[PDB]
Design an enzyme around this catalytic site. Structure first.
Site, PDB file in Angstrom:
ATOM      1  N   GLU A 152      -5.103   3.972 -10.705  1.00 41.96           N
ATOM      2  CA  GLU A 152      -5.891   2.768 -10.447  1.00 41.96           C
ATOM      3  C   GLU A 152      -7.038   2.675 -11.422  1.00 41.96           C
ATOM      4  O   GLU A 152      -7.341   1.603 -11.939  1.00 41.96           O
ATOM      5  CB  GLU A 152      -6.413   2.751  -9.022  1.00 41.96           C
ATOM      6  CG  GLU A 152      -5.312   2.624  -8.003  1.00 41.96           C
ATOM      7  CD  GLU A 152      -5.847   2.562  -6.588  1.00 41.96           C
ATOM      8  OE1 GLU A 152      -6.203   1.444  -6.164  1.00 41.96           O
ATOM      9  OE2 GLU A 152      -5.899   3.623  -5.913  1.00 41.96           O
TER      10      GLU A 152
ATOM     11  N   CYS B 156       0.810  -1.216   0.000  1.00 49.68           N
ATOM     12  CA  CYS B 156       0.000   0.000   0.000  1.00 49.68           C
ATOM     13  C   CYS B 156       0.843   1.265   0.000  1.00 49.68           C
ATOM     14  O   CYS B 156       1.595   1.517   0.945  1.00 49.68           O
ATOM     15  CB  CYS B 156      -0.936   0.034   1.213  1.00 49.68           C
ATOM     16  SG  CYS B 156      -1.975   1.514   1.261  1.00 49.68           S
TER      17      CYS B 156
ATOM     18  N   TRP C 123      -9.304   6.337  -0.571  1.00 52.40           N
ATOM     19  CA  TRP C 123      -9.630   7.101  -1.762  1.00 52.40           C
ATOM     20  C   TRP C 123      -8.665   6.671  -2.866  1.00 52.40           C
ATOM     21  O   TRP C 123      -7.626   6.062  -2.587  1.00 52.40           O
ATOM     22  CB  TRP C 123      -9.543   8.606  -1.518  1.00 52.40           C
ATOM     23  CG  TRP C 123      -8.247   9.066  -0.901  1.00 52.40           C
ATOM     24  CD1 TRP C 123      -7.045   9.286  -1.539  1.00 52.40           C
ATOM     25  CD2 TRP C 123      -8.033   9.370   0.479  1.00 52.40           C
ATOM     26  NE1 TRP C 123      -6.100   9.699  -0.623  1.00 52.40           N
ATOM     27  CE2 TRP C 123      -6.687   9.764   0.620  1.00 52.40           C
ATOM     28  CE3 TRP C 123      -8.861   9.357   1.616  1.00 52.40           C
ATOM     29  CZ2 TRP C 123      -6.143  10.122   1.849  1.00 52.40           C
ATOM     30  CZ3 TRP C 123      -8.320   9.717   2.833  1.00 52.40           C
ATOM     31  CH2 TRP C 123      -6.976  10.104   2.940  1.00 52.40           C
TER      32      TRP C 123
ATOM     33  N   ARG D 126      -0.036   4.503   2.922  1.00 55.82           N
ATOM     34  CA  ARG D 126       0.071   4.297   4.361  1.00 55.82           C
ATOM     35  C   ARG D 126       0.473   5.491   5.230  1.00 55.82           C
ATOM     36  O   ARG D 126       0.517   5.361   6.456  1.00 55.82           O
ATOM     37  CB  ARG D 126       1.041   3.155   4.629  1.00 55.82           C
ATOM     38  CG  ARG D 126       0.414   1.797   4.376  1.00 55.82           C
ATOM     39  CD  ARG D 126       1.441   0.705   4.618  1.00 55.82           C
ATOM     40  NE  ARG D 126       2.425   0.608   3.529  1.00 55.82           N
ATOM     41  CZ  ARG D 126       3.588  -0.029   3.646  1.00 55.82           C
ATOM     42  NH1 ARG D 126       3.913  -0.589   4.805  1.00 55.82           N
ATOM     43  NH2 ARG D 126       4.425  -0.109   2.608  1.00 55.82           N
TER      44      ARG D 126
HETATM   45  C1  HEM Z   1      -6.476   6.292   2.085  1.00 56.67           C
HETATM   46  C2  HEM Z   1      -6.016   6.288   0.833  1.00 56.67           C
HETATM   47  C3  HEM Z   1      -5.371   5.029   0.199  1.00 56.67           C
HETATM   48  C4  HEM Z   1      -4.684   5.054  -0.934  1.00 56.67           C
HETATM   49  C5  HEM Z   1      -4.413   6.323  -1.777  1.00 56.67           C
HETATM   50  C6  HEM Z   1      -4.235   3.716  -1.227  1.00 56.67           C
HETATM   51  C7  HEM Z   1      -3.480   3.321  -2.307  1.00 56.67           C
HETATM   52  C8  HEM Z   1      -3.304   1.994  -2.631  1.00 56.67           C
HETATM   53  C9  HEM Z   1      -2.999   1.480  -3.945  1.00 56.67           C
HETATM   54  C10 HEM Z   1      -2.827   2.360  -5.199  1.00 56.67           C
HETATM   55  C11 HEM Z   1      -2.887   0.151  -3.852  1.00 56.67           C
HETATM   56  C12 HEM Z   1      -2.623  -0.831  -5.009  1.00 56.67           C
HETATM   57  C13 HEM Z   1      -4.036  -1.394  -5.254  1.00 56.67           C
HETATM   58  C14 HEM Z   1      -4.096  -2.223  -6.508  1.00 56.67           C
HETATM   59  O1  HEM Z   1      -3.159  -2.095  -7.332  1.00 56.67           O
HETATM   60  O2  HEM Z   1      -5.076  -2.998  -6.684  1.00 56.67           O
HETATM   61  C15 HEM Z   1      -3.139  -0.233  -2.475  1.00 56.67           C
HETATM   62  C16 HEM Z   1      -3.117  -1.511  -1.948  1.00 56.67           C
HETATM   63  C17 HEM Z   1      -3.481  -1.905  -0.674  1.00 56.67           C
HETATM   64  N1  HEM Z   1      -4.012  -1.097   0.341  1.00 56.67           N
HETATM   65 FE1  HEM Z   1      -4.007   0.964   0.219  1.00 56.67          FE
HETATM   66  N2  HEM Z   1      -4.654   2.881  -0.221  1.00 56.67           N
HETATM   67  C18 HEM Z   1      -5.386   3.659   0.680  1.00 56.67           C
HETATM   68  C19 HEM Z   1      -6.025   3.217   1.822  1.00 56.67           C
HETATM   69  C20 HEM Z   1      -5.974   1.973   2.410  1.00 56.67           C
HETATM   70  C21 HEM Z   1      -6.672   1.553   3.621  1.00 56.67           C
HETATM   71  C22 HEM Z   1      -7.649   2.445   4.440  1.00 56.67           C
HETATM   72  C23 HEM Z   1      -6.345   0.262   3.846  1.00 56.67           C
HETATM   73  C24 HEM Z   1      -6.765  -0.680   4.998  1.00 56.67           C
HETATM   74  C25 HEM Z   1      -7.265  -0.245   6.173  1.00 56.67           C
HETATM   75  C26 HEM Z   1      -5.407  -0.138   2.810  1.00 56.67           C
HETATM   76  C27 HEM Z   1      -4.811  -1.374   2.677  1.00 56.67           C
HETATM   77  C28 HEM Z   1      -4.265  -1.842   1.497  1.00 56.67           C
HETATM   78  C29 HEM Z   1      -3.877  -3.212   1.264  1.00 56.67           C
HETATM   79  C30 HEM Z   1      -3.969  -4.426   2.224  1.00 56.67           C
HETATM   80  C31 HEM Z   1      -3.356  -3.252  -0.162  1.00 56.67           C
HETATM   81  C32 HEM Z   1      -2.835  -4.516  -0.868  1.00 56.67           C
HETATM   82  C33 HEM Z   1      -4.061  -5.201  -1.448  1.00 56.67           C
HETATM   83  C34 HEM Z   1      -3.686  -6.402  -2.259  1.00 56.67           C
HETATM   84  O3  HEM Z   1      -2.650  -7.056  -1.943  1.00 56.67           O
HETATM   85  O4  HEM Z   1      -4.450  -6.693  -3.220  1.00 56.67           O
HETATM   86  N3  HEM Z   1      -5.217   0.916   1.952  1.00 56.67           N
HETATM   87  N4  HEM Z   1      -3.382   0.925  -1.761  1.00 56.67           N
HETATM   88  C1  LIG Z   2      -8.364   0.919   0.333  1.00 54.11           C
HETATM   89  C2  LIG Z   2      -7.941   1.063  -1.108  1.00 54.11           C
HETATM   90  C3  LIG Z   2      -7.547   2.295  -1.612  1.00 54.11           C
HETATM   91  C4  LIG Z   2      -7.167   2.378  -2.945  1.00 54.11           C
HETATM   92  N1  LIG Z   2      -6.783   3.551  -3.479  1.00 54.11           N
HETATM   93  N2  LIG Z   2      -7.196   1.285  -3.738  1.00 54.11           N
HETATM   94  C5  LIG Z   2      -7.560   0.078  -3.273  1.00 54.11           C
HETATM   95  C6  LIG Z   2      -7.611  -1.103  -4.223  1.00 54.11           C
HETATM   96  C7  LIG Z   2      -9.009  -0.891  -4.806  1.00 54.11           C
HETATM   97  C8  LIG Z   2      -9.540  -1.864  -5.843  1.00 54.11           C
HETATM   98  C9  LIG Z   2     -10.739  -1.518  -6.470  1.00 54.11           C
HETATM   99  C10 LIG Z   2     -11.309  -2.347  -7.432  1.00 54.11           C
HETATM  100  F1  LIG Z   2     -12.463  -2.015  -8.042  1.00 54.11           F
HETATM  101  C11 LIG Z   2     -10.674  -3.532  -7.772  1.00 54.11           C
HETATM  102  C12 LIG Z   2      -9.479  -3.890  -7.161  1.00 54.11           C
HETATM  103  C13 LIG Z   2      -8.867  -5.211  -7.573  1.00 54.11           C
HETATM  104  C14 LIG Z   2      -7.519  -5.078  -8.264  1.00 54.11           C
HETATM  105  C15 LIG Z   2      -6.966  -6.461  -8.630  1.00 54.11           C
HETATM  106  C16 LIG Z   2      -7.332  -7.492  -7.566  1.00 54.11           C
HETATM  107  C17 LIG Z   2      -6.031  -7.917  -6.901  1.00 54.11           C
HETATM  108  C18 LIG Z   2      -4.950  -7.555  -7.908  1.00 54.11           C
HETATM  109  N3  LIG Z   2      -5.487  -6.427  -8.698  1.00 54.11           N
HETATM  110  C19 LIG Z   2      -8.905  -3.063  -6.187  1.00 54.11           C
HETATM  111  C20 LIG Z   2      -7.953  -0.049  -1.944  1.00 54.11           C
END
Ligand code: HEM
Ligand SMILES: Cc1cc(N)nc(CCc2cc(F)cc(CC[C@@H]3CCCN3)c2)c1
Ligand code: HEM
Ligand SMILES: Cc1cc(N)nc(CCc2cc(F)cc(CC[C@@H]3CCCN3)c2)c1
Ligand SMILES: C[C@H](O)[C@H](O)[C@H]1CNc2nc(N)[nH]c(=O)c2N1
Ligand SMILES: C[C@H](O)[C@H](O)[C@H]1CNc2nc(N)[nH]c(=O)c2N1
Ligand SMILES: [Zn+2]
Lengths: 410, 414
Positions: A285, A108, A280, A111
């Site tokens: 994305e 993420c 957000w 963070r």
């Molecule tokens: C608040 C603004 C946030 C932004 C801008 C953000 C941004 C991102 C982005 C761009 C990714 C890559 C997602 C993808 O490629 O599918 C990601 C992954 C992730 N985020 Fe964040 N995120 C946010 C909030 C959060 C919150 C609130 C949580 C949990 C409480 C969180 C937990 C995670 C986790 C666990 C992943 C990895 C998910 C996976 O392995 O598929 N994020 N985030």
């Molecule tokens: C909490 C949060 C914030 C943020 N900016 N983006 C995310 C991910 C949101 C998301 C939104 C969504 F519509 C679909 C996915 C899946 C992406 C695939 C599945 C695993 C590998 N790639 C993910 C979560």
């Protein structure tokens, strides 16, 4: 041993000591690195040391390690695992655990916000109707009329594996995908299988290009049930371009709220199989992956067409040029509608600042370069040049099996 | 370790099975508890006892490749090598083995996206070299051959292997062709900021610098562990390309150019436990190496701002993506300029597509293909290239190219 990470653009070197606290596997060995693999591969006896470890770090965080409260909490927990084969977290522990699962999420880039997370305790929930109410409240709270607020809703923990709470949606808000007669696909192709399950379950599909999917909710191991999120709760943004007047005519929109609902939250050995969380969007994305992945909305050709670009050779970089314009449009649209969004320049910048914060106060920051670096313009963002160490800290978010593979129906 | 490992492509759903990882040798830097996959770099000389099994493993591999494993010629080569290590503490590769080993070091280079070409490598045997002048001759011939008037051909020149570690052959240049960089008293930099240290070494060694923006550095060449000596590459051997844009007439006014031949000269080639500390190799460029890294890295030529100005972009908010916009145009110009001057170059779309095809073939014919995702994915437009969606396994096979200490850090001056 202390490990060093260098930024090759700024020459900054940080020292990682935090990695000495990790346990379960990365997937790598001394001989093979699996850094680009997306998914590598309880009882009373397993449970207490995990609970102990977590209680220990919680009381260490609030500066009362070894205290009477700490000592009694450990006893209470051991006694409880003894009799019920599990235990329940205190509210303060739940909140700490959820924030640190985010804090520890190596993939993420968002963070820097980790400690500003609104935690909704839904452990008293017993039915899919109850789940739907909780999820609506989440969506409403998190959307906040465009001024998005990070949130997590935590449903009852796993017990015997037969009574799992699950959100079958991978995300709370997604568009439907439809397999057309002619062979092509309407809507979002990533969701064709899930869309078909909803249809198979009684959902009447409008068969549009942006149909918001219903919620499919499973409580206590029972069959999942369909629910429509009230449309006033679903904030959307029509995408237009600040210079290309034709862009609005593409008919594109997206939803404002990214909300992951298929992951598992692990805290002190307890498993929360339904824990939808939201923040957000980063612009890429939507603009890069959702719109321009060949297996998703795949609009690059169309956009390049309207831009009248030379599309006969790859080396004209027509794809790269259409891609930038699409991502300009997305950021412009959200900002114009005052819906919270971050561009990949700002987000990666914030993440470097966050890393530096974490190395200073925590002795490190687990980070997955493969996921942290944005899907466009990689090396002109500062994370490209930043060495990262990846390791697994708990509490954590983990992947879990899709429920339609494990669920034995009525 | 498990016999079979699977990798998935998430765009195509294609799944490949890797068995080749079972032959992996040295460390990745990773452990069960920590991954160092984004870490760039994660005297002593092999003893008789360390050398035997390394030589045998290589010789076995060589004889397997030519379908003569267990043959009389195989057993005899094994015996000849063993005696030679016994009586001289080292051994000499046959020319066939040298060629095989160099080609496989390339084949095994997990950070290289260009490996579909690996079997087409021209190998120049310079193990008879004794002096820096001779090194200069060999390198000029390499450059001229590889350049081929713009129709570039991959090549490697291999100088004598390490003996006691006190008689190393080294090219002190990190690449055969690079532009000088000059630190000014006011803190600004003229030329390529990446090469300021090496440039000052050259100046100390006697180089007279023209102090310009694109001055080709001289070669600084060390033979047999002696002090390094300076040579100017004949300018007619250095093919350059002026950068212009197919649409922006003003792009040429930036006065940018680049050289056609990417030629790495600071790596160590390991074959059968033998160490070739001077083994310059060259290919042709992928456009992004120039257009994104050389020109747009902040600590390099860093031209994004000036390109954006002439493009009349709003540069006050990052969310206008003015940087991304200018980055694309710079890379369009670079590919356009090379193609127009008929100098081999490959765009990142073509290169990564070819790499996927290569990797699939290797999985099927060889049992795997070590690849470093962090390096293989291009520095712009990552996810619209097929390698972004491709899971990869990274591991070290030998023969291999390796990093080695900078020679000015270890050299004992005579
Ligand atoms: C608040 C603004 C946030 C932004 C801008 C953000 C941004 C991102 C982005 C761009 C990714 C890559 C997602 C993808 O490629 O599918 C990601 C992954 C992730 N985020 Fe964040 N995120 C946010 C909030 C959060 C919150 C609130 C949580 C949990 C409480 C969180 C937990 C995670 C986790 C666990 C992943 C990895 C998910 C996976 O392995 O598929 N994020 N985030
Ligand atoms: C909490 C949060 C914030 C943020 N900016 N983006 C995310 C991910 C949101 C998301 C939104 C969504 F519509 C679909 C996915 C899946 C992406 C695939 C599945 C695993 C590998 N790639 C993910 C979560
Ligand atoms: C023929 C066309 C070739 C192409 C298109 C190509 C492409 C590339 C690219 C884009 C990189 C990343 C470079 C960087 O970011 O600094 C790279 C790295 C590398 N290439 Fe290739 N290459 C080619 C030929 C060769 C040859 C002939 C060899 C060796 C015989 C080779 C061995 C390597 C090695 C060892 C690396 C890693 C370098 C490092 O760690 O700094 N390549 N290649
Ligand atoms: C053989 C070959 C082909 C090709 N297309 N590219 C290369 C690399 C050429 C190259 C050319 C060059 F000028 C510089 C470098 C290395 C730059 C930085 C320094 C530390 C880490 N990387 C590399 C080699
Ligand atoms: C920190 C990170 O490992 C470093 O910036 C890497 C990233 N990937 C790269 N990829 C290539 N091809 N070349 C590079 O120099 C780098 N640099
Ligand atoms: C194969 C590779 O691991 C896979 O495509 C990853 C690469 N990096 C990513 N990075 C992010 N943020 N999101 C992703 O879905 C992916 N996909
Ligand atoms: Zn690893």
């Amino acid at each position: 041993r202390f490990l060093k990470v260098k930024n090759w653009e700024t020459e900054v070197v940080l020292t990682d000591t935090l990695h000495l606290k990790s346990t379960l596997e990365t997937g790598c060995t001394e001989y093979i690195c699996m850094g680009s693999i997306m998914h590598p591969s309880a009882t009373k006896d397993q449970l207490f040391p995990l609970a102990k470890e977590f209680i220990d770090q919680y009381y260490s965080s609030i500066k009362r390690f070894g205290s009477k409260a700490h000592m009694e909490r450990l006893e209470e927990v051991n006694k409880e695992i003894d009799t019920t084969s599990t235990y329940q977290l205190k509210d303060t522990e739940l909140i700490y655990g959820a924030k640190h699962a985010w804090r520890n999420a190596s993939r993420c880039v968002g963070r820097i916000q980790w400690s500003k997370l609104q935690v909704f305790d839904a452990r008293d929930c017993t039915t899919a109707h109850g789940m739907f109410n909780y999820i609506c409240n989440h969506v409403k709270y998190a959307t906040n009329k465009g001024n998005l607020r990070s949130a997590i809703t935590i449903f009852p923990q796993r017990t015997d594996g037969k009574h799992d709470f699950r959100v079958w949606n991978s995300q709370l808000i997604r568009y439907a995908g439809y397999k057309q007669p002619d062979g092509s696909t309407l809507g979002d192709p990533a969701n064709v299988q899930f869309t078909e399950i909803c249809i198979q379950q009684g959902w009447k599909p409008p068969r549009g290009r942006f149909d918001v999917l219903p919620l499919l909710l499973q409580a206590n191991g029972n069959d999942p049930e369909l629910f429509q999120i009230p449309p006033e709760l679903v904030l959307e943004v029509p995408i237009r371009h600040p210079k290309f007047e034709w862009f609005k005519d593409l008919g594109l929109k997206w939803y404002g709220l990214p909300a992951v609902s298929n992951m598992l939250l692990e805290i002190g050995g307890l498993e929360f199989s339904a824990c939808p969380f939201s923040g957000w969007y980063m612009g890429t994305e939507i603009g890069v992956r959702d719109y321009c992945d060949n297996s998703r909305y795949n609009i690059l050709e169309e956009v390049a067409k309207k831009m009248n670009l030379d599309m006969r050779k790859t080396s004209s970089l027509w794809k790269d040029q259409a891609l930038v314009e699409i991502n300009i449009a997305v950021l412009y649209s959200f900002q114009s509608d005052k819906v919270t969004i971050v561009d990949h320049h700002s987000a990666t910048e914030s993440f470097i600042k966050h890393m530096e914060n974490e190395y200073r106060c925590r002795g490190g920051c687990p980070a997955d370069w493969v996921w942290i670096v944005p899907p466009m313009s990689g090396s002109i963002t500062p994370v490209f040049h930043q060495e990262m160490l990846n390791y697994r800290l708990t509490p954590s978010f983990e992947y879990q099996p899709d429920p339609w593979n494990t669920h034995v129906w009525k």
